[PDB]
Amino acid sequence: HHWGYGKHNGPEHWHKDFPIAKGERQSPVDIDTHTAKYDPSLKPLSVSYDQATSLRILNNGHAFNVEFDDSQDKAVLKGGPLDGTYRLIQFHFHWGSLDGQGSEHTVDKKKYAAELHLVHWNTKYGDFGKAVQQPDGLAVLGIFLKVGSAKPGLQKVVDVLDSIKTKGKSADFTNFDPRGLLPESLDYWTYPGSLTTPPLLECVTWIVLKEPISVSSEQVLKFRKLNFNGEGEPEELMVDNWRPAQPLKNRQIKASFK
């Protein structure tokens, strides 16, 4: 016990330990596609994951993280709305108990079955732990998942999940290529916001891709077999680990495309 997604420690409770839950730049938000302004001055996003080095995959009791070696400039995000260079540290997903829900961002109130977060930290702050303390410390690239055809490049991730079923298990996870998770287009919306889990730090430039990837019902079924609890504790399925949309307040969502 600590924060979680249940009725007693879920998102509606987070504020009591992390008062910034109710701040002015919280995530996720609903993306009102008609209100987002086209911005012709935005650069194309630059995703260079050519030399990415995955190390490990971890169940942390909230989701699973695939972690990358971020000790050199190997997998970087740049361009788009970003000044400077951000390094890939980890990716994880948020998903639902049913296909009808699971994403954190919504697009005109539409919920996707899941959402991928590729998390990068601003190289000028030297590490992740320092970047999160800064208003432009992180750039998270969000990609929606819908259920239809399998994504072949996600299969290696779904196959290792049996080995990390419960909170705290980890496993070796080398030579995973994150480029196999990206849709065709790099069209995106961008707005300033926060971590979507405690400590909810307001340190993120959110880059949310317009085009979802499609994954198979069998692939997302396997996410749903993971556990929130630790090994030899009562079984709580890891499902519905998403924060709902937070008020937009004084913020504009820009679009890279018309």
Ligand X SMILES: NS(=O)(=O)c1cccs1
Residues acting as catalytic residues:
62
Residue of the chain from 17, 108, 172, 231 that contacts ligand X (CB under 6 A): 17
Residue of the chain from 1, 7, 34, 37 that contacts ligand X (CB under 6 A): 1
Residue of the chain from 36, 119, 182, 209 that contacts ligand X (CB under 6 A): 119
- With CB cut-offs between 5 and 8 Å by kind, which of ligand X, Zn ion, none does residue 64 bind? none
Q: Is 105 in the site for Zn ion (CB under 5 A)?
A: no
Question: In Å, how far are 157, 158, 164, 165 from 230, measured between CA atoms?
Answer: 20, 19, 10, 9
The answer to whether 256 and 39 are in contact (CB under 8 A) is: yes
Question: In Å, how far are 127, 209, 214, 254, 258 from 197, measured between CA atoms?
Answer: 19, 20, 25, 23, 31
Residue among 217, 156, 144 at smallest CA distance from 182: 144
Any alpha helices (H) in 186-236, and if so which ranges?
Answer: 217-223
Residue of the chain from 106, 190, 196, 219 that contacts ligand X (CB under 6 A): 196
- With CB cut-offs between 5 and 8 Å by kind, which of ligand X, Zn ion, none does residue 124 bind? none
Q: Which residue in the shown chain puts its C-beta closest to ligand X?
A: 3
Q: Is 37 in the site for ligand X (CB under 6 A)?
A: no
92 is in an annotated binding site: yes
Q: Using H for helix, E for strand and C for coil, what is the string for 103-172? A: CCCEECCECCCEEEEEEEEEHHHCCHHHHCCCCCCEEEEEEEEEECCCCHHHHHHHHHHHHHCCCCCEEE
197 is in an annotated binding site: yes
Residue among 1, 80, 5 at smallest CA distance from 244: 5
Q: Is 120 in the site for Zn ion (CB under 5 A)?
A: no
| Residue 258 beta carbon to ligand X: minimum distance, rounded to whole angstroms | 28
- With CB cut-offs between 5 and 8 Å by kind, which of Zn ion, ligand X, none does residue 16 bind? ligand X
Residue of the chain from 31, 82, 116, 195 that contacts ligand X (CB under 6 A): 195
Q: Which residues bind Zn ion (CB under 5 A)?
A: 117
Q: Which residues bind ligand X (CB under 6 A)?
A: 1-3, 9, 13-14, 16-17, 117, 119, 140, 195-197
